């Protein structure tokens, strides 16, 4: 698989004609007019999918997120950082060759769901 063929797969899975990318392969999908999930290669073998969500609500969330920030054997796990303004930055890091259009679409929907809470298709 290549990065660009993976994006083609992902567009097809979502029912878009194309996920355009800039010079460095940075692409984006806008969700319900307001949220944006960004896609980019980060090294030779891996890409990320990520979004800025809302401001942290309180100390309670930081514990909740950290209690869940544990290693996993799964792929497409959603992780959470804070930006300099205490907004959540939600992200997943994936192997280009190991992932599919379907898993990327699951990542996208999981990213969006977290934000709110805070080859043929395999769907």
């Amino acid at each position: 698989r290549t990065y660009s063929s993976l994006l083609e797969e992902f567009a097809t899975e979502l029912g878009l004609e194309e996920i355009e990318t800039n010079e460095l392969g940075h692409g984006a999908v806008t969700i319900d007019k307001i949220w944006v999930v960004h896609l980019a290669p980060i090294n030779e073998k891996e890409l990320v999918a990520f979004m800025r969500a809302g401001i942290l609500t309180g100390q309670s969330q930081l514990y909740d997120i950290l209690r869940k920030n544990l290693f996993s054997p799964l792929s497409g796990v959603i992780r959470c950082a804070l930006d300099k303004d205490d907004h959540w930055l939600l992200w997943s890091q994936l192997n280009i060759n190991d992932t599919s259009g379907t898993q990327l679409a699951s990542v996208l929907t999981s990213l969006v769901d977290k934000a709110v809470t805070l080859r043929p298709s395999s769907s």
């Binding site: 940075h26 692409g27 999908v29 806008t30 969700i31 944006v36 800025r52 929907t109």
Partner: peptide, 28 residues
């Protein structure tokens, strides 16, 4: 633009969001 699992989705983003992404990606 289409509908996917209850979400309205389109390729693209407002420029400020692309700027934000460029910032995050340039600091890793």
């Amino acid at each position: 633009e289409t509908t996917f699992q209850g979400l309205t989705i389109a390729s693209g983003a407002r420029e400020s969001e692309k700027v934000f992404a460029q910032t995050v990606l340039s600091h890793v």
